[PDB]
């Protein structure tokens, strides 16, 4: 029993470092995701001040894709968010980026803004990413 | 008894790390709701400097709906409030938004500001949302 | 005894979360009321730089009611005070607001500033609200 | 005696929770009085850069009473001092205010600054208030 | 023994909140005296950039007395130092002030700066105050 | 048992002080790497606003190498990152630097921007460094 | 041991916040000396951007003595360093000051800058003060 | 055992106060070295934006020695680094300074920038100092 107690004593305090450090990392994670969430306004399935896609009854793309790409670069790298976010969150963002980026590449000599999307697979996939990404960000700080 | 004591010890400290993270999240929640509350001035059932609806004795809408939508976007996404608020609070805000947004869409070539509302269901629903939303925000930080 | 010990331990530490979070909320309450108190200068029964009512021997209203309404909106909503204040404090403020607001609505084409009040019930009620509100704010942070 | 052991412990841990709030309030009190003390320069019985009363050997009043009233309004209401100060401190300040305010009201078409006081009761009462107020402020933060 | 235990516990924890508050006051005292010390440059018995008295072999007064009085008013009242300093420190400062103030009052139509002091009692008393005041300030924060 | 107790106590508390310093260093490490991560945008294998290499289907270099070198100098030395990063992270950065630096040295009288790379070994090595460096930075703060 | 228990416990706790206050004072001492150290650049026995004395093989004085005196006044009095420094540190600084000050007083109608020192006792004493002062400042914060 | 207990208690708590002061000093040391490290860019054996020595295959000196001396003065004295750094770190910096300073003194009427070094002993010694200094700074904060 005495031997077990001593082990608990060292294991318990030791766990003191984990109690103290784990906290510091959590606080950094909380800020990294708090600042990432705003990026989701571009991926919304509701109308907004900006958005990427506009609903009609359709699904026209906007040139706000340029704003999305710039906000994306700042949050993932310049603000350091990429460190505290999971591989799943990064994968979902990367796929979304390629869908909207691809759209702009096809537009080329874009005949004004607001361009109709005829392949609905891209539309449905963007909506699914929004839901999966919103959940992955929301639960990033909800594990305690 | 000794075996149980060890289990209680581990539960007790382990709970220490949870004691320090739950606190950090609470403080973030408190700030997220403190900054959201101001949005409620637009939904008030009393007279105010601005408001959306004006009482007369009929429930005329104001063009302050534009201020509401802009303040809404900033608080939910740019300031990160959407992370720390419940699904019920978001649902209530979304419904309210659609009622006032719809009103503006009907106005189109709006014949000046201050437009009468003839369908009282929208008026009564907006008031009920104000009460439910005010309570949901108020209790967000009142669970300890 | 053993059952009480571990049961006592769960009741105790657990109370550790309440010991901390309760503290964080208290500090927010203290600031919310510290910033609300200044609003009371408008409701004073003594002379001041501004005030609403001026004593003579009377009770003339001033146009400083406009300053009161603007300060009121900022403190209750923009600064988030409304969250940390009781229903009684809000009820007292709301009644006061309606008394002074009503006065201004009656004035309409106001024949200059400083207008006599002939119905003393409003005068006595405003003074009583000042006393009740001053106490309700003062005791908001005095429960420990 | 298990119940007895449980009692004292609950009283103590509960007292630790109360220990964390009493501290927070003390710190607010300390700042509220630190900023109030400067107001006393106007009530001094010694010569100063400004003061209210000037000694000669008679007790002439200065027009610095206007500075006193403005500083008084700011400290009691705008800075929130009125919350953390006792009724005795407020009573003493209020009486002083009325003595100097009354003086200015009598002056009316004031024949320049520096006006002699012929009723020595006001002079002696102002000095006594200075001493009582200086002590009441000084001891506000000296109870531990 | 049992009676002392619980009685001892009430004496102990209770002291805990009081030990905290004592800490908060100490820190305020430390800052109040740190900012007061600079005032002593005017009372030095060595040469300096400014000083009040200049040594020659004499003891000529400078018009820097005006700087002293202004710095004195700011530190004792505007910065709140007067709260955290002892009666002895205030008495010593007050006497010094009256010696230098008196000198200026005698100068009247001052025949330029740098005026000789012929009564050496004032010179020796100012030096003694410097030493007593320097010690009283230095020990203000040295009691633990 | 007694010998282990006091010996255990010396091992324990002693650690306790080490529980704090380890924490302070961790927090510094976390910030040093948070600010280093942004440097990785230059080494990405995806398209970006800037990047070094552009994908086509060939691996053309950009003159953004100048931005990379300047950002590198600031993060490693001026911001002090070099202290809190491992030898492996520094080795990987140094090799990358020499690959891109060498490229620029070969360009000399560079025939405009966007220059093709014909030796694919450099291309594949840069991609491998990106992956190894991204992991080494990511795990720098993940050891608790 | 029972007698020691209660008395020992009171002595122990009592010490508790005295260790706290000791901490607060230490931190103030650390800052006071951190800001004093820079003053030593003037007393160096090596070449520098400024210095007081320049080595040649000599020992010419510079007019940088004026910079020394001004920096000295600011650090000892305006920044409050004089409180947290020992009598030995102050004595060493005072002697140094008088050596360089005396030099300037002898120069009078100074025949340009860079004046040779012919009495080597002053040169050797200044170097010895530098070493003693450097040690006294360095050890001021090294007693734990 | 009883004697060891109370004796052990005096050894223990006592240490406890010191485990807060040791912490405070560590944090100051960490900052002092974090800000010193940047100085090493001048001593690097790799190419850089500035550097002192440039590699060719040689070892030409640059006039950036002036930048080195100015940065050196600021970090050792004005920022207070000299307090928290070891004698070995200071000795290594001093020797380096004299090597580069000497070089500039020999240059005199310097025939433009970029001057070849023909005595390789200075070149090899500067590189060795870089390695020894880099290690001494790096380990300054790595003893826990």
UniProtKB/TrEMBL annotation, chains A, B, C, D, E, F, G, H:
The keyword Membrane applies. Keywords: Membrane, Transmembrane, Transmembrane helix. NCBIfam families: CAS_Csx28. This is Uncharacterized protein. The lineage of its organism: Bacteria, Pseudomonadati, Bacteroidota, Bacteroidia, Bacteroidales.
């Amino acid at each position: 029993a005495a031997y077990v107690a001593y082990y608990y004593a060292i294991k318990q305090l030791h766990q003191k470092s984990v109690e103290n450090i784990e906290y510091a990392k959590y606080q950094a994670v909380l800020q990294a995701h708090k600042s990432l969430y705003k990026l989701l306004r571009f991926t919304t399935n509701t109308e907004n001040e900006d958005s990427i896609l506009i609903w009609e009854k359709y699904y026209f793309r906007k040139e706000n894709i340029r704003k999305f790409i710039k906000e994306l670069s700042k949050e993932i790298y310049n603000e350091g968010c990429g460190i505290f976010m999971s591989k799943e969150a990064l994968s979902l963002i990367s796929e979304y980026r390629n869908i909207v980026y691809g759209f702009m590449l096809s537009a080329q000599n874009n005949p004004q803004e607001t361009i109709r999307i005829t392949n609905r697979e891209s539309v449905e996939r963007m909506k699914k990413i929004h839901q999966n990404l919103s959940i992955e960000i929301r639960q990033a700080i909800n594990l305690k």
